[PDB]
Amino acid sequence: GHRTLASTPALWASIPCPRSELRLDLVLPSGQSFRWREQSPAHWSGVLADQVWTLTQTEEQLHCTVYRGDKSQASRPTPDELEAVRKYFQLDVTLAQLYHHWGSVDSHFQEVAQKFQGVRLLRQDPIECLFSFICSSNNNIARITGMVERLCQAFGPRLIQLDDVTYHGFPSLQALAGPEVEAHLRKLGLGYRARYVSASARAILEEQGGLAWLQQLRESSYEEAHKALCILPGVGTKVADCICLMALDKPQAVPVDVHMWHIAQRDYSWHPTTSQAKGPSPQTNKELGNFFRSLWGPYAGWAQAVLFSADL
């Protein structure tokens, strides 16, 4: 079954990481990745790179364990595996520097940060992020979490079973580009966005030269990446910004939806001054995003994530 640090200590290895730099409970269930669950108190299990991990923390350390299945002997994560975890959590960025900057320009942020410490922005795989945000509206974390689980159960490789939980890899393009994908996703309860999952997979595979197209957007400017993503069925401005932020290494991206508007009004008394519109629209949404980029700086999307963790 699922491991705990206490039950099987020799299968865990550690990364130095103060709780000031990372709070798993404030990050993993906060609406960035949908692949994690707290199966044991303070222990988060999920898929990171088509492998199952469990993570837990002590005061100065992130402890990690990886499940290898029947082909390999059980052993602690290797140094390269642990680096993969560090990259996922972007641990080379000093969060304290960012928090100090954001609090210096934003008193509301500084207030919220006192309770919501160690909220980091994950660095997600581009396929996984794209298709997670295509497959469901992101109106409720519980809904999207369920839809993503169904998608991976449907078209993702079976990795391992732990207790009553069967973990799947994220689906491949080829899997998602099949005939019958839409219909089978609608049969599982995904509804009209099932069509976008299929069509976007086929678009990337057939028309854009495959996975490399999407991977190249990590190196491309925010402007090029956003525009490129918007060509895909099911991706408009907000999803494209989500992907840019969360998987294409554009920390400046600030996705704008009704949730962000609510925070802007509730916590900032913000009103648009460019647009004629009083409410969400393409022009006013752009304005809002540029507002927070201008306020918070080049890591504005990371600052947004702190406020989203606090709002849950």
Residue numbers in the entry: 12 to 323
Tell me, in the authors' exact words, what the paper reports:
The CrystalDirect system enables the automation of sample mounting and cryocooling and can contribute to closing the automation gap that currently exists between crystallization and X-ray data collection.
Some of these crystals grew in conditions that require the addition of cryoprotectants when processed by standard manual methods. However, in all cases tested the automated laser mounting and direct cryocooling after liquid removal with the CrystalDirect robot produced samples with very good diffraction properties leading to high-quality structural models.
